[PDB]
Design an enzyme around this catalytic site. Sequence first.
Site, PDB file in Angstrom:
ATOM      1  CG  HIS A 131      -0.581   0.422   2.277  1.00 23.61           C
ATOM      2  ND1 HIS A 131       0.154  -0.325   3.152  1.00 23.61           N
ATOM      3  CD2 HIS A 131      -0.207   1.717   3.002  1.00 23.61           C
ATOM      4  CE1 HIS A 131       0.120   0.058   5.030  1.00 23.61           C
ATOM      5  NE2 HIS A 131      -0.300   1.568   4.519  1.00 23.61           N
ATOM      6  CG  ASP A 165      -0.449  -3.747   2.623  1.00 18.82           C
ATOM      7  OD1 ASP A 165       0.453  -3.666   1.749  1.00 18.82           O
ATOM      8  OD2 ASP A 165      -1.036  -2.485   3.482  1.00 18.82           O
ATOM      9  CB  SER A 167       2.315   2.135   7.049  1.00 17.50           C
ATOM     10  OG  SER A 167       1.268   3.009   7.999  1.00 17.50           O
ATOM     11  N   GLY A 168       4.518  -0.320   6.653  1.00 18.78           N
ATOM     12  CA  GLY A 168       5.390  -0.449   6.034  1.00 18.78           C
ATOM     13  C   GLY A 168       7.107  -1.002   6.823  1.00 18.78           C
TER      14      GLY A 168
HETATM   15  O1  LIG Z   1      -2.723   3.975   9.488  1.00 22.02           O
HETATM   16  C1  LIG Z   1      -3.552   3.731  10.257  1.00 22.02           C
HETATM   17  N1  LIG Z   1      -3.814   2.743  11.424  1.00 22.02           N
HETATM   18  C2  LIG Z   1      -2.249   1.821  12.153  1.00 22.02           C
HETATM   19  C3  LIG Z   1      -2.458   1.408  13.433  1.00 22.02           C
HETATM   20  C4  LIG Z   1      -1.652   0.681  13.403  1.00 22.02           C
HETATM   21  C5  LIG Z   1      -0.602  -0.543  12.578  1.00 22.02           C
HETATM   22 CL1  LIG Z   1      -0.227  -1.918  12.876  1.00 22.02          CL
HETATM   23  C6  LIG Z   1      -1.053   0.449  11.420  1.00 22.02           C
HETATM   24  N2  LIG Z   1      -1.888   1.086  10.955  1.00 22.02           N
HETATM   25  C7  LIG Z   1      -4.982   4.158  10.707  1.00 22.02           C
HETATM   26  C8  LIG Z   1      -4.798   5.672  11.024  1.00 22.02           C
HETATM   27  N3  LIG Z   1      -4.449   6.654   9.938  1.00 22.02           N
HETATM   28  C9  LIG Z   1      -5.446   8.414  10.574  1.00 22.02           C
HETATM   29  C10 LIG Z   1      -4.134   8.676  10.770  1.00 22.02           C
HETATM   30  F1  LIG Z   1      -3.642   8.229  11.977  1.00 22.02           F
HETATM   31  F2  LIG Z   1      -3.049   8.727   9.869  1.00 22.02           F
HETATM   32  C11 LIG Z   1      -5.594   6.506   8.759  1.00 22.02           C
HETATM   33  C12 LIG Z   1      -4.552   5.053   8.817  1.00 22.02           C
HETATM   34  C13 LIG Z   1      -5.924   3.812   8.024  1.00 22.02           C
HETATM   35  O2  LIG Z   1      -7.856   4.234   8.475  1.00 22.02           O
HETATM   36  N4  LIG Z   1      -5.715   2.601   7.728  1.00 22.02           N
HETATM   37  C14 LIG Z   1      -6.453   1.736   7.229  1.00 22.02           C
HETATM   38  C15 LIG Z   1      -7.312   1.429   7.824  1.00 22.02           C
HETATM   39  C16 LIG Z   1      -8.354   0.300   7.533  1.00 22.02           C
HETATM   40  C17 LIG Z   1      -7.885  -0.381   6.509  1.00 22.02           C
HETATM   41  N5  LIG Z   1      -8.770  -1.759   5.546  1.00 22.02           N
HETATM   42  C18 LIG Z   1      -8.717  -3.194   5.886  1.00 22.02           C
HETATM   43  C19 LIG Z   1      -8.915  -3.836   4.903  1.00 22.02           C
HETATM   44  C20 LIG Z   1      -9.907  -3.988   4.317  1.00 22.02           C
HETATM   45  C21 LIG Z   1      -9.681  -2.445   3.502  1.00 22.02           C
HETATM   46  C22 LIG Z   1      -9.549  -1.064   4.357  1.00 22.02           C
HETATM   47  O3  LIG Z   1      -9.580   0.283   3.650  1.00 22.02           O
HETATM   48  C23 LIG Z   1      -6.784  -0.072   5.696  1.00 22.02           C
HETATM   49  C24 LIG Z   1      -6.177   1.049   6.426  1.00 22.02           C
HETATM   50  F3  LIG Z   1      -5.232   1.705   5.605  1.00 22.02           F
END
Ligand SMILES: O=C(Nc1ccc(Cl)cn1)[C@H]1CN(CC(F)F)C[C@@H]1C(=O)Nc1ccc(-n2ccccc2=O)cc1F
Lengths: 234, 43
Positions: free
Chosen positions: A42, A88, A185-186
């Site tokens: 992603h 991913d 992320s990543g």
């Molecule tokens: O990155 C995130 N959180 C986060 C917390 C912990 C870990 Cl380990 C990794 N990431 C969040 C916070 N950010 C907001 C702010 F913190 F920047 C937006 C992001 C988001 O909504 N991601 C997000 C949510 C849901 C999905 N998703 C999942 C399954 C199917 C479809 C789908 O869209 C994809 C995403 F990238």
Amino acid sequence: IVGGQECKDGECPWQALLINEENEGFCGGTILSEFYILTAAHCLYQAKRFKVRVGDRNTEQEEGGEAVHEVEVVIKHNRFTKETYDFDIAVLRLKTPITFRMNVAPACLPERDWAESTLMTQKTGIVSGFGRTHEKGEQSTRLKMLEVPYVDRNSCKLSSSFIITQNMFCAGYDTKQEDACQGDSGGPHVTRFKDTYFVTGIVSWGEGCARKGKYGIYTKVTAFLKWIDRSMKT
Amino acid sequence: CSDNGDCDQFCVVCSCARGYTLADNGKACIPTGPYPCGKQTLE
Ligand SMILES: O=C(Nc1ccc(Cl)cn1)[C@H]1CN(CC(F)F)C[C@@H]1C(=O)Nc1ccc(-n2ccccc2=O)cc1F
Ligand SMILES: [Ca+2]
Ligand code: NA
């Protein structure tokens, strides 16, 4: 990283940072070898052109050991889709080889079957990165790390608005305000076995960050060990 | 295999990740260079 601590010198040496044309971090990576970085598929959608920075602990200070590498080949899993966020994973081949040094060294890749029974069954892993220090806040200028417990798959599925696939795993806390966040992320999720760190996850997604009743979602590296091996050999 | 068959890394038959060799004991893993995989770095 929400909560957790700053990485001390040499503590998170497999951390890589993907930087855009603004010279700003937007994703992490894991150093796999002198030529390969592991990241989230992603992350590839965020910036058409990006580079990789290794050895950085403070994005505001240019310190010894920091180095920039151009990416020669991007290998994105062909099954990745934003509809499900499944598969991913991406591997980056660098144009020039990384020189391992203080703050710059690879995480180990485990053997699949052993990792399923021996690493994925440990209590916790460590997630690191330069991501947001709060869901609404800014990215950290300092490299942070956080110990995250492995979370039962079924408890995670109950907590989640979205499908948790076998190419994912959950880690973190139910209500404790500690988690990875956007920008991590990543980046790496590593598990210690005896005295060695093996890469077990890729920071993938979450519903907000450190939300009560929500966990961090990681790409399950054991599912892609053959894929990674083929990608590093192509 | 698993008390991990007394192995330091993979598995009773032990093995290690690239950048290590299996010790004489056949249970321990020895780094081959100064920056083996998965070890924190020291000055
Ligand atoms: O990155 C995130 N959180 C986060 C917390 C912990 C870990 Cl380990 C990794 N990431 C969040 C916070 N950010 C907001 C702010 F913190 F920047 C937006 C992001 C988001 O909504 N991601 C997000 C949510 C849901 C999905 N998703 C999942 C399954 C199917 C479809 C789908 O869209 C994809 C995403 F990238
Ligand atoms: Ca710096
Ligand atoms: Na939570």
